[PDB]
Each structure stands twice: as structure tokens, then as C-alpha cells.
């Protein structure tokens, strides 16, 4: 399948109560492997998955120095961004940055991305050609002009097409037993009477990885997104994921309904009936 | 791996 690496930076000002708080995490696919919290005691980049810990001490010295360096620049950014919008020094504000690279089933570069956000709003993003910027407002135009003069995109394109994918493949090979597996969803179905003439059918998908999954309900074989309810896929907290989908049906008619589970760990999609 | 280059808005 496809694979990906993403880093997430969040920094939150707290005026009158110290420096902003900076947190960084890195993911491969749907699996966290590093974290950094500028309030935690160790002041170090830390491993969050078993395969990254065989990198050696130089990786961690390396990544810690860099993550500390970028923690300072989002600190400055909060100052700068408050000036661009002429907001007061009193209010707490947040800054986010995401970037990463995608890789295909043959492990070659697919796409790259690098975007910035201010108080939960899109501020500037690297377009798909990795050569020009999408800036939203007028304050972002300044940032766009600064980054254009600085050739930031050329530098970012070199990372995303080189360092990034190469290290993704490295992680993908060192984490082979966790990152390249497919756990088929364990499935069951539950039935709860609601009235004396209505009943809820819940279709369950447990213990599946990766997180992409499709749960669909049909009535007599025709898709039925009418009286349904479909919860967000959630982490199980041991690396696997969980999902369910429910439909309320008139009692005496449960056998007309089918749930269809589509997942990559399933050679053929799964039909379940009560 | 984190990207090295330090950018500012």
C-alpha cells in the first residue's frame, strides 16, 4: 500500500506565564515514533515506537538539537504573527505546522506537503508542485514574499523528495514487523431493542490496522445511508484501531439488512447479517 | 528525520 511520514508542530503562547509551549510528534502511517515537549523534563526527542530506538545515540542528539531549534522559531513566529494582525500581547495564540512525504507501493516519491496554520486557520501552504505558495490573507502575503525571496520552497522540495522519502524507507524497513503488517478487523454485530417496533443494529470492526476502513449498511442489498450512524475511527491504544456503524430498523425486519466491511487485511469484503 | 532548515513567518 501507500506509506507516509508526517511531522506535527504545535506552539501555544501563554503571556504572563512563561515561554510558549511547543510540542512536536512524528508519524509513519498511523503510528507515532517520536515526540518532543518543551515543558517535559528531559528536554530531549524521545522514542514512541520500538524500531526507532535502534538508531543509536547520534540520531537522538541530532533530532533533539533540531527540534529545539525549530521550537525557537515558532516561538518567534508567535511574536511576529501578533504584529501582522496587530493583536494585543495579552491573548494566548497558537501556531501549527505540518509536513511530510508520501510514497507509493513501489516505494518511490508520490507527493509532498508542508503547511502552516495560525489560530486554527490556514495561513500558508506549499502547493503540490513544491515550487509555489498558497497564502490566504494579507499577512500571509508578507510571509509568502519572505519565503519567495529566501528560496524556501526550493530547500523544502529538496528535503521532501530526498531526505524525507529516504528516511521513510529506512523506517519502513527497520519497523517492518509493525509498519508493514495488516491486521484484519475482528467483526461482530449487536442488536438492541429501542421501542416495541424499532431496533438498533450495530456492526463492529475491532483490532484492525491500518486505520482506513469502510463500514456500509444495505437494505435488501441496496446501500442505505438514511437512518444510520457512523462513528469516527478511534485508536484502541495498543496500536490497533476500532470502528462501528449502526442503523435503526423496524423489528421483525432485521434480516433485510447487511453490513459490509471493506479493509486491506480482508481478501474479500465481509457481509454480516443478524 | 526532521528537516533541518529553520524558517520564520
Amino acid at each position, epitope marked *: 500500500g501507500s506509506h507516509s511520514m508526517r511531522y506535527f508542530f504545535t506552539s501555544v503562547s501563554r503571556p504572563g506565564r512563561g515561554e510558549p509551549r511547543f510540542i512536536a510528534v512524528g508519524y509513519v502511517d498511523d503510528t507515532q515514533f517520536v515526540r518532543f515537549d518543551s515543558d517535559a523534563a528531559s528536554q530531549r526527542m524521545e522514542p514512541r515506537a520500538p524500531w526507532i530506538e535502534q538508531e543509536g545515540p547520534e540520531y537522538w542528539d541530532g533530532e533533539t*538539537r*533540531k527540534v529545539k*531549534a525549530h521550537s*525557537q*522559531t515558532h516561538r*518567534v513566529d508567535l*511574536g*511576529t504573527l501578533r504584529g501582522y494582525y496587530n493583536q494585543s500581547e495579552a491573548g494566548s495564540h497558537t501556531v501549527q505546522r505540518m509536513y511530510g512525504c508520501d510514497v507509493g507501493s513501489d516505494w518511490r516519491f508520490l507527493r509532498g506537503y508542508h503547511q502552516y496554520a495560525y489560530d486554527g486557520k490556514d495561513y500558508i501552504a506549499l502547493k503540490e508542485d513544491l515550487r509555489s505558495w498558497t497564502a490566504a490573507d494579507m499577512a500571509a502575503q508578507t*510571509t509568502k*514574499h*519572505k*519565503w519567495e*525571496a*529566501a*528560496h*524556501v520552497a*526550493e*530547500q523544502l522540495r*529538496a528535503y521532501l523528495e530526498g531526505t524525507c522519502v529516504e528516511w521513510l524507507r529506512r523506517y519502513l524497513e527497520n519497523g517492518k514487523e509493525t509498519l508493514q503488517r495488516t491486521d484484519a478487523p475482528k467483526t461482530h454485530m449487536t442488536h438492541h431493542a429501542v421501542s416495541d417496533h424499532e431496533a438498533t443494529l450495530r456492526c463492529w470492526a475491532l483490532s484492525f490496522y491500518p486505520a482506513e476502513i469502510t463500514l456500509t449498511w444495505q437494505r435488501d442489498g441496496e446501500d442505505q445511508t438514511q437512518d444510520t450512524e457512523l462513528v469516527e475511527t478511534r485508536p484502541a491504544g495498543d496500536g490497533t484501531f476500532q470502528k462501528w456503524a449502526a442503523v435503526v430498523v423496524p423489528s421483525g425486519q432485521e434480516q433485510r439488512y447487511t453490513c459490509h466491511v471493506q479493509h486491506e487485511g480482508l481478501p474479500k469484503p465481509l457481509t454480516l447479517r443478524w | 528525520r526532521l528537516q*533541518s*532548515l*529553520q*524558517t*520564520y*513567518v
Partner: T-cell receptor, first 115, second 110 residues
Framework: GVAQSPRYKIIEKRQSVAFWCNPI?????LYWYQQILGQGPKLLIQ????????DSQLPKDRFSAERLKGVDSTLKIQPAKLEDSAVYLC??????????????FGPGTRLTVLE | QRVTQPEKLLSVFKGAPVELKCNYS??????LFWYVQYSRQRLQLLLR??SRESIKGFTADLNKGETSFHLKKPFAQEEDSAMYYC?????????????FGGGTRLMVKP
């Protein structure tokens, strides 16, 4: 362009001296460089907005710099040594990437410290 | 971020080829620049690696095996007489700080 004052300066050793630098309007990165005769410029201190980014190769025992409002900056030598005779260059960048960017230089301040 | 310009002085005739050496030693991620200062003029940028640009007839190519960024030009002109400085922006240093080489004076005899 970048402005610097004064252009030339003679002082006796163990004395003090202050250089002044006005960046190009709106540049968030400001640099102080020392350029000794026969050598390239050597970075003293780098500012982003009003904060210090790189203090490392700055003699803190005698050199001190300030950019309180993230515009103009002042560098001070107290007290001066003979080895401080050099051209002191300030410079600035738009600031989107600090020193990984074009740096625009002032004319410099030729300091001459004498016995 | 060592930047080594081996020659201090380079003397050539108008219309002869120009090669200003630059080697560098940096364990991290670098960006490479050449800066120039014409006489009674300010230190100013000449070119940047990642711009893939040619300025005033000048080209330089980053060789990562040889860790070099030599400045080359096939036909020297008198307007080219100036001081040249190799520079390294080091991304693993705070603020991607810049380290200059020692300089090479270029004299193009008329």
C-alpha cells in the same frame, strides 16, 4: 540600504566605543560581523526580531549588543583591546530563513585601537 | 562550518578563464553562497547555489563528493576585479548562521 555610523573611529585601548546600525526597512534578521584584516567576516551576534539567535562567537566579557525594538541595533566594546581593530559590519535579511538568505551589508565601521 | 578559500590572490589577464576555489567542511545540511565586494563598494551577494543561477557571467556547481563550490567563468573581464568570499549557511546551527571563507582577491590585468 543598510546604514552604519560612524564610518571611522580612533580610540585608545581600555576605552569604550559604540557602533550603530539601521537595517533595511522591515528586515527581521540583523547581523553583526567582525572582519579582521586578511580574513573573511566572522559573525558576532545574530538577531531575529528583538531576540538573540546566536550569541556563541561573541566575547561576552567585552562585547555586548542590543536590538530592543527589532529595528536598529547597537554594538558596544567595553573595554577595547588592540586585537579589536577591525571593520565592524552589520547586515540584514528579510528574515523568512535567517542567514539562509541574501544578506545585505552596510558600509562598515573601521575601528582603530591604539596604544 | 569551515569554509576554505585556498588562494588569497588570483591574477589573470582579460579574456583568460577564472576559477576561484572553495572547499567546505560541515557535518550537517549546508547552503552555499558566493559574495563579492567591488572596491569602495559594499559586500554584496554574487550568487546562491539553490537559485541555479548565473550572475555576471559566473557559474558555480556544488560537488558533494568533493565538498566544493568553485566559482568558474570562461572569459574574465576587468569589471570582475574584486574580492570574492565563499559562504556556508549551516542549517544545523542557530538561525542557519553564515560562515565566510577567507577571501580571494581577483585582479584581471588589462
Amino acid at each position: 540600504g543598510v546604514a552604519q555610523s560612524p564610518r571611522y573611529k580612533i580610540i585608545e585601548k581600555r576605552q569604550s566605543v559604540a557602533f550603530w546600525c539601521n537595517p533595511i526597512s522591515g528586515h527581521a534578521t540583523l547581523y553583526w560581523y567582525q572582519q579582521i584584516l586578511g580574513q573573511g567576516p566572522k559573525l558576532l551576534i545574530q538577531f531575529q526580531n528583538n531576540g538573540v539567535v546566536d550569541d556563541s562567537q561573541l566575547p561576552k566579557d567585552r562585547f555586548s549588543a542590543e536590538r530592543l525594538k527589532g529595528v536598529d541595533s547597537t554594538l558596544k566594546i567595553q573595554p577595547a583591546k588592540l586585537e579589536d581593530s577591525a571593520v565592524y559590519l552589520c547586515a540584514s535579511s528579510l528574515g523568512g530563513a535567517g542567514g539562509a538568505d541574501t544578506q545585505y551589508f552596510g558600509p562598515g565601521t573601521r575601528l582603530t585601537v591604539l596604544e | 562550518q569551515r569554509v576554505t578559500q585556498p588562494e588569497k590572490l588570483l591574477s589573470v589577464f582579460k579574456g583568460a578563464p577564472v576559477e576561484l576555489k572553495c572547499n567546505y567542511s560541515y557535518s550537517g545540511s549546508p547552503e552555499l553562497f558566493w559574495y563579492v565586494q567591488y572596491s569602495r563598494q559594499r559586500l554584496q551577494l554574487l550568487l546562491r547555489h539553490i537559485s541555479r543561477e548565473s550572475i555576471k557571467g559566473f557559474t558555480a556547481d556544488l560537488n558533494k563528493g568533493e565538498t566544493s563550490f568553485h566559482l568558474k567563468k570562461p572569459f574574465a573581464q576587468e569589471e570582475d576585479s574584486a574580492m570574492y568570499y565563499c559562504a556556508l549557511s549551516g542549517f544545523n546551527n542557530a538561525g542557519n548562521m553564515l560562515t565566510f571563507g577567507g577571501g580571494t582577491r581577483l585582479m584581471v590585468k588589462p
